[PDB]
Amino acid sequence: CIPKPGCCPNVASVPKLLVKGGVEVLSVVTGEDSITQIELYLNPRMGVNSPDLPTTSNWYTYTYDLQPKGSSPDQPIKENLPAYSVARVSLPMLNEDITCDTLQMWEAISVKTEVVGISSLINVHYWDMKRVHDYGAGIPVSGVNYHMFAIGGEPLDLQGLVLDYQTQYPKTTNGGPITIETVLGRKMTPKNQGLDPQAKAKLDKDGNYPIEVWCPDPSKNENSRYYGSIQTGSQTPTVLQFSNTLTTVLLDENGVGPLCKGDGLFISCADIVGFLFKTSGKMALHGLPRYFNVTLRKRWVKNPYPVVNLINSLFSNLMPKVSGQPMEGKDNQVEEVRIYEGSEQLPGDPDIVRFLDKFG
Amino acid sequence: IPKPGCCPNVASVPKLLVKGGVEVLSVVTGEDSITQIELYLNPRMGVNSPDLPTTSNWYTYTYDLQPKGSSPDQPIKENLPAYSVARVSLPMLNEDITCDTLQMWEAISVKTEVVGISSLINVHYWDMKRVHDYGAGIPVSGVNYHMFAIGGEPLDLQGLVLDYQTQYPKTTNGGPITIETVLGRKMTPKNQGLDPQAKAKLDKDGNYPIEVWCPDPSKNENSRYYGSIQTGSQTPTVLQFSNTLTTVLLDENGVGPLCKGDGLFISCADIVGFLFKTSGKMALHGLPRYFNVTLRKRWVKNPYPVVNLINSLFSNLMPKVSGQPMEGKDNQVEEVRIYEGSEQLP
Amino acid sequence: DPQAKAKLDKDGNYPIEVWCPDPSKNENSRYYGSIQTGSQTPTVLQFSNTLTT
């Protein structure tokens, strides 16, 4: 009891939707050609990081009043240090094949993003705003802008750089932010005021890596895709775009996207929109959330790490350690290493040099 | 009886059938017809009508908005610019019940531009503030907020406010729709951030303030919205306009928005800048937008069963009944029997 | 106001600050425009004989 297919008018075809719902639907098993698409959001962390606090939640997505100390050295408080936002999405664990030494792994291909709440900025009638002139309206949110987001299978690697090492950031033992001297274990030097390879860290926590200290490391971030921009000025305007037709492709020059190591998706962002010119003349920054629409798929990859050697590390018996003289690092005690493979015709110099600069 | 060889070849352009006003929509067309609609949307800046002679002088403007200076804030409706919206009632179409398919409208492309850009060079408004002594008036400049949207269902909004302390006017019939109007409870500091619970659909015209509501990117799968902003005290207003520009509405899969309910929904809002008065006060200003939507007929498949579909209609046509109970609590039914087929007496 | 429309008849007699190209009716003509509104906002302009439209 079915109609003739030649009679039916042609109709286009589209990707078949199987499931739509909350995060619970990630535990659904799927075929190999399936495609998963996650929509989430991240509120900004501008020092005031929670509305549930009874006392000081009135300035959520804001910052306590910013102003220089006037006397060396600077001693800023946690609230005046905007920090990156970050979150992890626990993806479902996929299949693996031992006999081929291969395994599926989640790959991100495209993300759709836009800043939410842009239209809120036209509020020129906040009661404590600073009027541009007598009997006029206030000065809308404008000035400094720092926009940045990143997606990858690893936590975002990042580099440290400070405008002035003289600053004494709040101590970490209070559970607060993480500055450079927390990582290095020693006070910063003028080196840290420029680039310092010693100063590196991975984006572990939310609201604890101040933006004015840490910047994304372009070297190590190879399994992640980060985009950013800046705009610094007294009252420079806030220019922003938003639409749902813009899609950004995350694929690389090899045609592969970020690989979700550990069956986890790592997302991070931060958006500063400008100051809030209070009537008293004080200032305070403001931030807005971001909407993320990650498009994921399944890719087959070879297992790079030997299984047995891994578990061997976990046992003290099969991986004995010793607190001996240094054989790695700056003070290593290995004078030379030579690696031979195969055979060739006899060279005329056992002290082979490879650099023309070395002949002198 | 003409001679084909004698006559020169002429190009082939799409054939026009009918041209006119809204009454055109009632005509019947074929499967491959294409329809264009040209319309406009006046802005809504708190002053939302010219017909009332009491205060219509400040049409497309606000009432001299400025900060109070003392907590809390009690802004008035006429300082709350809101989105514009309208619905076009499209006609009914054909279907093929045998193949369980049918056709509904889709938007494929919209041509648009702002109207009245040229009127901004009026730097001689009699109460416009001079830039300096014996100078000329300060032109319309400052804050801008432009957006427009085309979709088959009304635009889905997201609520976010610069200050939850700001208490908005009570939602009197014909008033502004704010956060606490939706939730039924006073706002919390979360609303200064993102709150998934504070969502709403763009119901009415000129009642959804812009400084509160923003287009929800998740829920809006069936409409296309574009937007921009610049926030400056006196930053200039740059605007372009032409009729050669056209924006495609097709998605990744090559399908536009589908007009659910045989009607397309559109929304727009264009803040153009401040108006500086000699007294020093400041007020915003807007301009209309011209929309030229190109529509076609697309075949689609019915995903829902008919029996569940028809009862829904009956659910709406006949009113709910609050009668004596017949549910398991205190049922007033005492016995139920069911017979199926013949048999022998026990 | 759709009542207020008019064709561009004469020179020097149609104030810019009053009239704008009706988007709906100009279907047999191509028009391009811009604007820049400020007190002392600089004037940026470009010119060449290589570009065409």
Ligand SMILES: [Ca+2]
């Ligand atoms: Ca590298």
Ligand SMILES: [Ca+2]
């Ligand atoms: Ca969605």
Ligand SMILES: [Ca+2]
């Ligand atoms: Ca026309």
